[PDB]
Design an enzyme around this catalytic site. Structure first.
Site, PDB file in Angstrom:
ATOM      1  N   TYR A 105      15.474   3.681  -5.457  1.00 33.30           N
ATOM      2  CA  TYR A 105      14.432   4.006  -4.487  1.00 33.30           C
ATOM      3  C   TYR A 105      13.175   4.552  -5.178  1.00 33.30           C
ATOM      4  CZ  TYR A 105      11.757   6.454  -0.900  1.00 33.30           C
ATOM      5  OH  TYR A 105      10.743   6.911  -0.082  1.00 33.30           O
ATOM      6  N   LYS A 117       9.337   3.044  -5.436  1.00 33.70           N
ATOM      7  CA  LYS A 117       8.127   3.720  -4.984  1.00 33.70           C
ATOM      8  C   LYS A 117       7.146   3.938  -6.136  1.00 33.70           C
ATOM      9  CE  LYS A 117       8.671   4.213  -0.485  1.00 33.70           C
ATOM     10  NZ  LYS A 117       8.092   3.230   0.482  1.00 33.70           N
ATOM     11  N   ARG A 125      10.135   4.162  14.344  1.00 37.64           N
ATOM     12  CA  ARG A 125       9.732   5.281  13.491  1.00 37.64           C
ATOM     13  C   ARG A 125       8.276   5.202  13.016  1.00 37.64           C
ATOM     14  NH1 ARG A 125      13.985   8.374  11.349  1.00 37.64           N
ATOM     15  NH2 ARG A 125      13.230   8.124   9.189  1.00 37.64           N
ATOM     16  N   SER A 136      -8.326  -4.646   4.158  1.00 39.17           N
ATOM     17  CA  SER A 136      -7.603  -3.678   3.322  1.00 39.17           C
ATOM     18  C   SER A 136      -6.090  -3.729   3.477  1.00 39.17           C
ATOM     19  CB  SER A 136      -8.121  -2.247   3.527  1.00 39.17           C
ATOM     20  OG  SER A 136      -7.672  -1.726   4.758  1.00 39.17           O
ATOM     21  N   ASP A 195       5.327   7.661  -1.501  1.00 37.25           N
ATOM     22  CA  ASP A 195       6.160   8.852  -1.339  1.00 37.25           C
ATOM     23  C   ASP A 195       5.527   9.995  -2.119  1.00 37.25           C
ATOM     24  OD1 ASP A 195       8.270  10.855  -1.435  1.00 37.25           O
ATOM     25  OD2 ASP A 195       9.705   9.266  -0.955  1.00 37.25           O
ATOM     26  N   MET A 218      12.284   4.249  -8.351  1.00 41.10           N
ATOM     27  CA  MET A 218      11.714   3.171  -9.165  1.00 41.10           C
ATOM     28  C   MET A 218      10.848   2.264  -8.299  1.00 41.10           C
ATOM     29  SD  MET A 218      15.032   2.313 -11.505  1.00 41.10           S
ATOM     30  CE  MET A 218      14.356   0.773 -12.144  1.00 41.10           C
TER      31      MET A 218
END
Ligand SMILES: NC(=O)c1ccc[n+]([C@@H]2O[C@H](COP(=O)([O-])OP(=O)(O)OC[C@H]3O[C@@H](n4cnc5c(N)ncnc54)[C@H](OP(=O)(O)O)[C@@H]3O)[C@@H](O)[C@H]2O)c1
Ligand SMILES: NC(=O)c1ccc[n+]([C@@H]2O[C@H](COP(=O)([O-])OP(=O)(O)OC[C@H]3O[C@@H](n4cnc5c(N)ncnc54)[C@H](OP(=O)(O)O)[C@@H]3O)[C@@H](O)[C@H]2O)c1
Ligand SMILES: NC(=O)c1ccc[n+]([C@@H]2O[C@H](COP(=O)([O-])OP(=O)(O)OC[C@H]3O[C@@H](n4cnc5c(N)ncnc54)[C@H](OP(=O)(O)O)[C@@H]3O)[C@@H](O)[C@H]2O)c1
Ligand SMILES: NC(=O)c1ccc[n+]([C@@H]2O[C@H](COP(=O)([O-])OP(=O)(O)OC[C@H]3O[C@@H](n4cnc5c(N)ncnc54)[C@H](OP(=O)(O)O)[C@@H]3O)[C@@H](O)[C@H]2O)c1
Ligand SMILES: Nc1nnc(CCCl)s1
Ligand SMILES: Nc1nnc(CCCl)s1
Ligand SMILES: Nc1nnc(CCCl)s1
Ligand SMILES: Nc1nnc(CCCl)s1
Lengths: 249, 249, 249, 249
Positions: C155, C159, C13, C136, C142, C157
């Site tokens: 999830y 991000k 992905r 870097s 998100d 929290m």
């Protein structure tokens, strides 16, 4: 055929670097200016020397007034007149001076600061969209909008409104395939009116290298946003501030 | 001696509820209005029947123009004329209508939407501060500024500029002890222009209760911010939106 | 000598596209994976066939636990052992599933969701920095963090914490010349667990093209951020969401 | 019947002020504490002397572990055991110390900082909801999360995660009538460790009065949020910082 770009306030400093880098990328450019006629003509000469008939100048006052929509329509018109197309608009022109809450009249200050930073970008966006590949608009924002300069209310209001425009126009122009993004400098080329002691103070504050951004570094972000590598990016404001906005008082 | 407040656009709806609640808390009130003269005078009558000479009306167009600074000064002046002091300013008056990018001229739309939502608040803030306990300003913002109504660019720009003013003025006026905060409704009293079917659609979107905020619930947040319970709060914007801004598309 | 990059969750992905694009830019790559052993090895084979000795795999569970610091040290060590250097870290691996507030135990859910999305990035950042030119780190964030999926508290929290890490590490590592940035997708490659009707629902919400971002479009933003064109950019999170986050409920 | 509240880290400082103000408003209180046993008992004594059987203490370590869900469930259970109900949860307990990226082990630092500031609040929120009138949760956030203390990555990640929780929980629990909000101090009661000169340095940064917030000023904002005056407010974080977050570097 070569794409075409309008850059406002492009005679000097950051706008100039943006126009140069766009031209080097293969854009034909409209170099808008207000007072810097000599600088604008000099730049157009340099770019045309590099590639014939690829740069023109366009003078316009971007102060708010009842004639401002006509002036902004004319700026977009000038790109079509010269190049038969307009693919990119960069809203760079900006008035920046103090307007304390506690010289120019307040109505002139409102007209200049809100006109240049917000209303003109809005009207240029309108004219750009109506006159309509890879179409996009890039708005020069400010990384420090939430931690503003003391006594710069009108400028800050302008730059906030520009965030609003960026988001609103990104949403509304998406079905037309027009992307709308921002680049937000922290400190780049310091204002000419700034004293050397204050310049050094600002430099010391930047976490990444204790130095202001070059005009070219700002231009690089503009280049990315107009490119094919940003085809899904719209309504985004990229901070280019070396971590300045992350530093507490 | 009782404190005094100016509430802009206080004849109807949210502004009215704010004026009423301030008055019930012990404030003398200037009821500013534009077109709603009958409602304004009637409100002042109701409040004066409650406590003698504790309410006055003041009419002014808050559209941007060269006379707006004088108009805003006179609104603040009307508070001092009536009550000899001005402790609270509530910037509530607001134009709200679409301005698509693609009967009113665009320059009129700019003047009304940026004037009422941003420029008038700035000028009122200037005049409030110049003319100077628990002094504060409350700006009626919008919880949905970052998820704006389609084709409402000028409105959204105005509300973004108001966030900037809230922050800039909080910073600048803090040394004078003037706090500057915002209240940001999501959906409260729905526009009269909106059809009942569309009204119901918006109500259904609100996580907290599937209903809009009452004007009184918005007023409660204003009351908190002006109160002694918020004496350390400045530059804050309280969403009162029942979770609306938290809901994805 | 070619620069080297670590990409977490790089077998499939978005992580896969990022590793491929970094490799195509001239990086040697460490392909981290958890369960997708066949895909990881297949990718390494493909990249090595392209240019010899430019790709290795490293397996690790990034769930929070008392062994995680050692696992993260191991992943960074892998880059140094194979390539003699580590120039870029891409924190991409992510657990993403509902954790309703009102079968995996809750402590496992915390460990997996906070571990992959926040703690591992932190520990990897530590190991990367301690072991140290254009250095870097890019964190996969998100765009919808402020308009989160219903019942995805942990999830979200995770991000949110990742945004905090991005900013905190950008500040702290700036004097070392290490830039720390984020790329925030809206909808890109839809989760395999999502049903087809819901997939098309999300696609239809995107203003820019009514389709999800390809993983390559996400990778394009990563490439920009690690490049010489982003040398002054640190602490910035670039949305790559086609205007999705701008859309109200 | 008087409503009941749980306040974590309530033995001293801000937590104490919140517990006291809640009690003064008419709440029965659970005073949670970790190490401050004597101070917790002494507070419960003062409140019970004022009104009989209205205060209890509850010891619990809020460090992240596989038993943390059980501890958080027990904290909520103790409110039900003492008072037969639990109307308000205040997440105030917090570890705060530097965790530089370049004799507590890193795994302890993660467990304490992410546990106290984020995971415990999540688990307490879960337990509070499952066990279920004006129900709400107030989370103690940080106004400076985007301008963080140098070398405080894990603390900052925890407080960002707490913002995420606040928003995610507001969304999910709105259908149950449970509101979830935040209060975000800038500088309030300074760490006991700090020397007087360093305290004054921070005081001098605050625009509004050149001083830190009192614990009572913070508690005032918590009281507003739990009250009937905030019945439409959910997912909001109120900064109580005297303009600190608005001050540039
Ligand atoms: N430089 C920084 O550190 C920094 C920091 C944050 C944000 N920014 C933003 O980045 C952009 C470029 O920065 P900069 O410093 O290069 O800008 P600048 O030099 O302050 O302004 C650029 C041009 O704006 C034009 N302008 C001013 N008033 C005008 C008016 N009334 N009508 C039409 N044009 C007008 C001027 O053109 P003429 O000279 O031809 O009259 C000026 O050269 C601006 O939008 C600025 O707000 C810069
Ligand atoms: N209602 C909501 O769901 C909602 C949502 C988000 C934000 N807000 C904000 O909350 C505040 C109150 O909302 P609302 O719905 O009560 O406002 P509103 O009814 O739309 O407008 C309030 C008053 O603004 C005054 N006004 C409009 N144009 C003016 C002008 N050119 N000059 C002077 N005054 C003018 C009008 O006064 P006259 O009637 O006397 O002409 C109007 O009654 C506004 O700032 C609004 O933007 C409301
Ligand atoms: N896809 C989107 O539309 C979208 C939207 C917003 C944000 N993002 C962010 O962009 C990044 C890439 O998205 P994606 O959809 O490609 O991610 P994804 O497929 O959900 O996950 C990527 C990899 O994470 C690894 N992983 C999961 N749990 C792990 C664990 N406990 N330990 C170690 N590795 C673990 C898995 O590796 P193995 O397969 O080897 O087990 C998985 O292949 C993620 O950070 C995601 O949160 C994506
Ligand atoms: N003070 C400020 O200027 C400021 C600024 C920004 C944000 N805040 C936030 O406001 C809230 C209150 O601030 P404060 O300064 O009063 O807090 P604090 O004194 O730093 O800590 C409050 C309580 O947290 C508890 N605690 C610490 N570690 C714990 C653990 N492992 N398990 C259980 N409890 C633990 C301690 O309880 P025991 O004493 O019983 O061990 C402590 O009394 C905190 O959430 C803080 O992050 C405060
Ligand atoms: N337009 C500008 N905004 N900020 C600048 C640098 C002063 Cl710190 S120029
Ligand atoms: N001024 C207004 N902003 N939002 C409103 C409710 C329509 Cl959804 S009125
Ligand atoms: N990790 C992910 N975050 N958001 C996604 C799209 C589902 Cl709507 S995947
Ligand atoms: N928890 C805390 N966060 N910030 C504080 C004040 C130190 Cl300047 S205490």
């Amino acid at each position: 055929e070569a794409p075409a770009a309008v850059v406002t306030g492009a005679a000097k400093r950051i706008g100039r670097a943006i126009a140069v880098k766009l031209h080097q990328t293969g854009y034909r450019v409209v170099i808008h200016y207000h007072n810097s006629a000599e600088a604008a003509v000099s730049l157009a000469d340099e770019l045309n020397k590099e590639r014939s008939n690829t740069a023109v100048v366009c003078q316009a006052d971007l102060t708010n007034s009842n004639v401002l929509p006509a002036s902004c329509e004319e700026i977009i018109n000038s790109c079509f007149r010269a190049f038969g197309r307009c693919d990119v608009l960069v809203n760079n022109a900006s008035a920046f001076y103090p307007t304390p809450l506690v010289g120019k009249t307040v109505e002139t200050q409102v007209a200049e600061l809100i006109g240049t930073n917000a209303i003109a970008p809005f009207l240029l966006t309108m004219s750009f969209a109506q006159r309509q590949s890879n179409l996009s608009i890039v708005n020069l924002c400010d990384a420090m909008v939430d931690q503003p300069c003391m006594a710069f209310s009108l400028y800050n209001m302008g730059k906030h409104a520009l965030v609003g425009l960026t988001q609103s126009a990104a949403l509304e122009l998406a079905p037309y395939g027009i992307r709308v993004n921002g680049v937000a400098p922290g400190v780049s080329l310091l204002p000419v009116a700034m004293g050397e002691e204050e310049k050094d103070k600002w430099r010391r504050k930047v976490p990444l290298g204790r130095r202001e951004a070059s005009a070219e570094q700002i231009a690089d972000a503009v280049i990315f946003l107009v490119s094919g590598s940003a085809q899904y990016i719209t309504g985004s404001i990229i901070k280019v501030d070396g971590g300045l906005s992350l530093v507490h008082a």
